[PDB]
């Protein structure tokens, strides 16, 4: 499913992401925009052989199991396919563990390079939440 901006903001809010670990909701909506363009089904393979899955492009090297990434750790204990669902719950629960891992949202390269230090507030402007 390709989410609408405000539609995604609301689902993430309900899921408890607004201000989780100190990151306002705009940060999360900006990161999804640049990571997957709001598409739950987005996948991207990396040179190391791992693949990124879903709305938040969670990597198979550490967080989920896709059965084809030798040495992966599956820290969120879920098949990577679960992250492509129209229901974002799994992606959100895993993202919560990732952002708590020590490096915050810097774990997401698109956030670091395109959202960090910008007016992320604009990403939820106009939405009824």
The DSSP code for 97 is H
> Could you tell me the resolution of this structure in angstroms?
2.0
Copy the structure tokens of residue 102: 């020590």
C-alpha distances in Å from residue 85, one per residue of 22, 36, 80, 129: 26, 13, 10, 22
Q: In what order do the strands lie in the sheet with 43-45?
A: 43-45, 51-53, 58-59
Residue 7 a catalytic site member: no
Can you point out the beta strands (E) in the chain?
43-45, 51-53, 58-59
Tell whether 87 is in a known binding site: no
In degrees and rounded to multiples of 5, residue 59 shows phi and psi of: -85, 140
Catalytic residue among 52, 66, 87, 119: 52
Residue 52 a catalytic site member: yes
Residue closest to 40 by CA, chosen among 3, 77, 10, 13:
3
The domain spans of the chain are 1-129
Letter string b/e over residues 96-129, b meaning 16 or more CB atoms within 10 A of that residue's CB: eebbeeeebbebbebbeeebbeeebeebbeebee
Place of tokens 């879903």: 54
In degrees and rounded to multiples of 5, residue 101 shows phi and psi of: -70, -5
Copy the structure tokens of residue 35: 């990571």
Catalytic residue among 35, 48, 66, 119: 35
Pick the CATH number of 1-129 from 1.10.530.10, 3.40.1280.10, 3.30.70.2700, 1.10.1330.10: 1.10.530.10
């Amino acid at each position: 499913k390709v989410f609408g901006r405000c539609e995604l903001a609301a689902a993430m809010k309900r899921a408890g992401l607004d201000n989780y670990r100190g990151y306002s909701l705009g940060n999360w909506v900006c990161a999804a925009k640049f990571e997957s363009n709001f598409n739950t089904q987005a996948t991207n393979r990396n040179t190391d052989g791992s693949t990124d899955y879903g709305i938040l492009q969670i990597n198979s090297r550490w967080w989920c199991n896709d059965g084809r990434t030798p040495g992966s750790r599956n820290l969120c204990n879920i098949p990577c396919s679960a992250l492509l669902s129209s229901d974002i719950t799994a992606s959100v629960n895993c993202a919560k563990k990732i952002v708590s891992d020590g490096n915050g949202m810097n774990a997401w390269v698109a956030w670091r390079n395109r959202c960090k230090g910008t007016d992320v507030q604009a990403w939820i402007r106009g939405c009824r939440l």
